[PDB]
Design a protein around this ligand. Structure first.
Ligand SMILES: COc1ccc(C(=O)N(CC(C)(C)C)c2cccc(C)n2)c(N2CCC(c3cc4ccc([C@@H](CC(=O)O)C5CC5)cc4o3)CC2)c1
Length: 411
């Protein structure tokens, strides 16, 4: 409440803000998360540099110690990096959400230049919106109430530059929570193991293959492969397909791998007794080897039916399958043993957990720092009875985003 306490809290924010954000930048410079943390660290620095001036203003109970014409420029130089901070948190939470909810789809669509593009658009939108609004409608500075005529303009700032990022961050945090519960499925697992190629290639066994691990023929003839490919799609392809056609063959093959297990007497008892994750591991095998091949793993299959996970793991490792494709086999074996997705880097529960925490941290620091000011500034044009201490507090909490913001990124 007293101006001396206001002064101190700003100084604390500066004093904590400066090192923490330089440290943040180095941590980011040592993926989309890094880009957003880097731009957040920079906007935090610009905000930090304006704090000494913000602090002396609070100490003088609102008195602006500089020429009145510099007040609009300082308003931009202070609020610009402030609002940008919010948007980066919103962008970062979006990247985390997309990574958590749609790992593979995200990774396919994602390009490094988009992250910068998004960041640029944020800087652009913020400075254009603030520069115009504060430039057209501006000895007291930031502590002063805005005239009721400046309402529509200042409201558009809060609406667009805070409330919208907030709502989006809230969506991303809820989506992240949902992603945790959703875990992962067999389609994602096989997409990682088989990869994606649009040209005809040879697998580790030397057979002609296309798409997401679709076996074309066991024949050594490339022309027989090109013939079987045109059968599978019903169109002359000449050894090249689209992503859409690949995904269609993928669902048919997963279906075929499942139906193969369903009609197998030696595979079906195990399939029936497993959970979905351990089921996914079985399907992966039958996808790679076929039903008869996997049916011959008599020992391992029996141990899996009796929930003897460790024994089964050790057994499966003695196979030709393990020696020919070790990385893939180890993942499928780990899946079998644990019944989790721990073996799959971009599908793991922890990765989804970190996204939830980043988004949650982001949502909270948006609510607590940039939140209170905008909530009270819009509530100043309505309700002419509003107390002055609400906006003054909001400016303090907003300043503290230079402390909170670097913490949520984890660098
Ligand atoms: C700081 O003030 C603001 C104000 C308004 C918004 C704001 O709401 N808008 C306005 C609009 C929706 C009506 C256009 C806004 C503005 C700039 C850029 C964007 C994308 N949106 C805003 N936002 C919120 C959504 C954010 C976002 C969504 C999003 C989705 C994918 C991604 C990428 C993740 C990555 O980098 O990998 C993925 C690759 C594509 C990055 C992404 O970043 C960007 C910042 C920030």
């Amino acid at each position: 409440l007293p101006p001396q306490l206001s002064f101190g809290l700003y100084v604390a924010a500066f004093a904590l803000g400066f090192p923490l954000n330089v440290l943040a930048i180095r941590g980011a410079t040592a993926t989309p998360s890094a880009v957003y943390a880097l731009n957040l660290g920079c906007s935090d620095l610009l905000l930090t540099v304006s704090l000494p001036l913000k602090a002396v203003e609070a100490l003088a109970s609102g008195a602006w110690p500089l020429p009145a014409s510099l007040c609009p420029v300082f308003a931009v130089a202070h609020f610009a990096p402030l609002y940008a901070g919010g948007g980066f948190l919103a962008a970062l939470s979006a990247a985390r959400y997309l990574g958590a909810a749609f790992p593979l789809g995200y990774q396919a669509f994602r390009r490094p230049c988009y992250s910068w593009g998004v960041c640029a658009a944020i800087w652009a939108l913020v400075l254009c919106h603030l520069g115009l609004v504060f430039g057209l409608e501006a000895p007291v500075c930031l502590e002063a109430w805005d005239p009721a005529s400046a309402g529509p303009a200042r409201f558009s700032l809060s609406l667009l530059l805070f409330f919208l990022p907030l709502a989006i961050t809230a969506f991303c945090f809820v989506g992240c929570l949902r992603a945790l519960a959703r875990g992962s499925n067999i389609f994602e697992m096989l997409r990682i193991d088989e990869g994606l190629r649009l040209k005809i290639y040879k697998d580790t066994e030397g057979y002609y293959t296309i798409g997401i691990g679709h076996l074309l023929t066991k024949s050594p003839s490339l022309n027989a492969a090109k013939s079987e490919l045109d059968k599978a799609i019903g169109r002359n392809t000449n050894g090249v397909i689209t992503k859409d056609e690949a995904e269609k063959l993928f669902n048919q093959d997963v279906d075929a791998a499942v139906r193969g297990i369903l009609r197998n007497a030696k595979l079906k008892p195990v399939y029936d007794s497993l959970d979905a994750v351990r089921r996914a591991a079985l399907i992966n095998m039958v996808f790679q080897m076929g039903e008869t091949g996997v049916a011959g793993f008599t020992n391992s299959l029996r141990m899996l039916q009796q929930k003897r996970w460790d024994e089964a793991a050790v057994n499966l490792a003695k196979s030709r399958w393990y020696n020919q494709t070790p990385n893939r086999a180890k993942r499928v074996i780990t899946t079998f043993r644990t019944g989790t997705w721990d073996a799959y880097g971009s599908l793991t529960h922890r990765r989804k957990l970190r996204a939830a925490w980043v988004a949650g941290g982001a949502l909270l620091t948006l609510l607590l720092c940039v939140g209170p000011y905008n909530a009270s500034n819009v509530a100043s044009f309505l309700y002419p009875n509003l107390g002055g201490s609400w906006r003054k507090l909001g400016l303090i909490t907003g300043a503290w985003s230079v402390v909170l913001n670097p913490l949520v990124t984890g660098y």
